[PDB]
Design a protein around this ligand. Structure first.
Ligand code: HEC
Ligand code: HEC
Ligand code: HEC
Ligand SMILES: [Cl-]
Ligand SMILES: [Cl-]
Ligand code: NA
Ligand code: NA
Ligand code: NA
Lengths: 80, 79, 80
């Protein structure tokens, strides 16, 4: 399995093109909230990695796939 | 002088130098930085010298040779 | 209690505390922090005590004695 790299995720989350921070804030307390402790996300109870891979960023979800998502997820866990 | 990347990470994020506003957190902002390239600009400068001589644009003298080297050392990690 | 600079780095960058919004990543933001100084403000407080008692402005109590000591230990490293 891939194992997310939090250091990569720090930079990927802040990436100007992905633009996560514009919608979610620096640590998920912006316009749309992210709970960094939750293990299931959305109506389909996806993992953090899969919700990011499949659905984020909204502009173009395919621009952050599985490894990107795994890295970002590892970084998001540190928010708590 | 040999760049210190821990220093470089803070200097790149420095609020006065403000590199991130123009270049993003990892060089994918409005103006791109390619962390793989070894020559930069029309005069084929090193990463260190392009930063020292030309950046930030507001006042290039605010990040001189040592600052540039530390920031360059950090930017390579984006590869 | 002896501050843990590694943890200080994490706390300083935490968006709930939001120290970087006002002070910058290395104390060169809107409000400066001098990492060499040993007295701060008009009651000549220690670095730890100014943070514990007064920062962040949104809610001083969100960063107590331990938090302040860790962050202070990190701030000293900016001198390098
Ligand atoms: C322009 C809008 C927009 C952008 C850009 C965007 N998001 Fe979202 N995101 C949303 C909205 C809207 C939701 C659903 C509301 C919510 O739960 O926060 C959401 C939900 C999420 C959730 C589920 C949150 C929860 O607690 O249920 C995660 C995780 C998330 N986004 C991460 C990211 C990451 C990582 C990026 C980019 C790297 C990103 N988002 C980019 C708008 C955005
Ligand atoms: C307000 C604008 C602005 C600020 C601030 C700024 N730059 Fe730049 N930078 C540019 C522009 C414009 C170019 C040339 C176009 C390009 O290469 O993206 C450039 C070019 C560069 C290049 C060469 C990239 C290339 O491929 O040719 C590097 C490296 C760079 N800047 C680093 C920095 C660093 C390090 C800082 C601050 C610590 C900084 N810049 C601050 C606008 C800025
Ligand atoms: C939204 C504003 C704001 C936030 C958030 C904030 N500060 Fe401050 N801080 C100030 C202001 C204003 C001063 C006093 C004015 C000055 O020093 O110019 C100050 C003073 C300080 C001083 C004394 C510096 C001196 O010599 O004058 C330290 C140290 C400091 N803050 C650290 C922190 C730390 C650590 C955090 C959060 C973890 C924090 N601050 C959060 C606004 C902020
Ligand atoms: Cl970026
Ligand atoms: Cl700064
Ligand atoms: Na995605
Ligand atoms: Na310069
Ligand atoms: Na406090």
């Amino acid at each position: 399995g891939y194992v997310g790299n939090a250091a990569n995720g720090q930079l990927l989350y802040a990436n100007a093109t992905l633009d996560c921070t514009n919608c979610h804030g620096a640590m998920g307390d912006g316009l749309y909230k992210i709970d960094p402790h939750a293990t299931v996300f959305g109506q389909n109870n996806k993992t953090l990695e899969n919700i990011i891979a499949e659905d984020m960023p909204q502009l173009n979800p395919a621009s952050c796939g599985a490894e990107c998502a795994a890295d970002i997820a590892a970084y998001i866990r540190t928010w708590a």
